[PDB]
């Protein structure tokens, strides 16, 4: 829906441009400024909602504990689950940040500045990262005490 | 409503002069003769009326639409160029007698 809204906005802008009006580029620039501020506001709202969901649809990440040659093993281990969580929150960010810019390079092709356009500061991103690290830390803490049982085989009768 | 002294633009043409011209036109066929100076003045006013009324309606319309523009300040920057040519035309025309 963001993409169609932006497409209609750009279509209206192009309709103005083809009419050969006066003093367009700065008007387009300030429209981009306002729309990027609004995008930053919506992005902070969505990011904080995603963070509180962690603490917005979220994929369920799963990994198993197995044993091979009588060695406790993880499939996948915890760090890969961390990477999947990071990828999911990257995709959640890209839901908004992949939106194209408005114009009469890569950054100029589609808008990537909403992080600096953050009205509340990096705290929301910081608290999201803090939630991720807390979750992974608790997971590995549970694993450590649970994985400790593997030392029994190491130790013959 | 505003403390400042507004320099409202008008047209140097009394709308009631044509009423005198039509009065003279009626009186000629009525058989009453008016002084020749009045005849010349009425004829000049009648022949110059369409230009004056066109001028006043055009300036009134331009004013109305420019106050509509400034009512929405988000549009004045785009509309500035057209207002610039309009102001240039007004500047050219004002110096004329």
């Amino acid at each position: 829906t963001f993409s169609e809204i932006l497409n209609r906005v750009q279509k209206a802008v192009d309709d103005l441009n083809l009419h050969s009006y006066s003093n367009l580029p700065i008007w387009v620039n300030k429209l981009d400024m306002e729309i990027e501020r609004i995008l930053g506001v919506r992005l902070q709202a969505g990011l904080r909602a995603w963070t509180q969901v962690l603490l917005p649809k979220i994929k369920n990440v799963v990994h198993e504990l197995r044993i091979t040659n009588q060695v406790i093993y993880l499939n996948p281990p915890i760090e890969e689950c961390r990477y999947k969580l990071y990828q999911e929150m990257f995709a959640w960010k890209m839901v908004v940040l992949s939106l194209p810019r408005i114009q009469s390079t890569e950054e100029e092709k589609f808008y990537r500045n909403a992080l600096t356009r953050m009205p509340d500061g990096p705290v929301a991103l910081e608290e999201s990262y803090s939630a991720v690290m807390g979750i992974v830390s608790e997971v590995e803490q549970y694993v450590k005490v649970w994985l400790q049982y593997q030392c029994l085989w190491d130790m013959q009768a | 409503g505003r403390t400042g002294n507004v320099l409202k633009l008008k047209v140097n043409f009394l709308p009631e002069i044509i009423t005198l011209s039509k009065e003279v036109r009626n009186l000629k066929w009525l058989g009453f003769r008016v002084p020749l100076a009045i005849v010349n003045k009425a004829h000049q006013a009648n022949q110059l009326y369409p230009f004056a009324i066109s001028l006043i309606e055009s300036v009134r319309t331009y004013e109305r639409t420019c106050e509509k523009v400034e009512e929405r300040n988000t549009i004045s920057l785009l509309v500035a160029g057209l207002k610039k040519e309009v102001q240039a035309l007004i500047a050219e025309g004002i110096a004329l007698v």
């Binding site: 003093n23 580029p25 | 320099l7 633009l9 420019c66 007004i90 500047a91 004002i94």
Partner: peptide, 28 residues
């Protein structure tokens, strides 16, 4: 050396133009 747009269209508020041309009419 990517060219940046120069000075945009100016407003020149109606009141200033009106007073300038009032002065010009007075002096003419």
């Amino acid at each position: 050396r990517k060219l940046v747009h120069d000075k945009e269209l100016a407003a020149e508020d109606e009141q200033v133009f009106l007073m300038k041309q009032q002065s010009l009419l007075a002096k003419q």
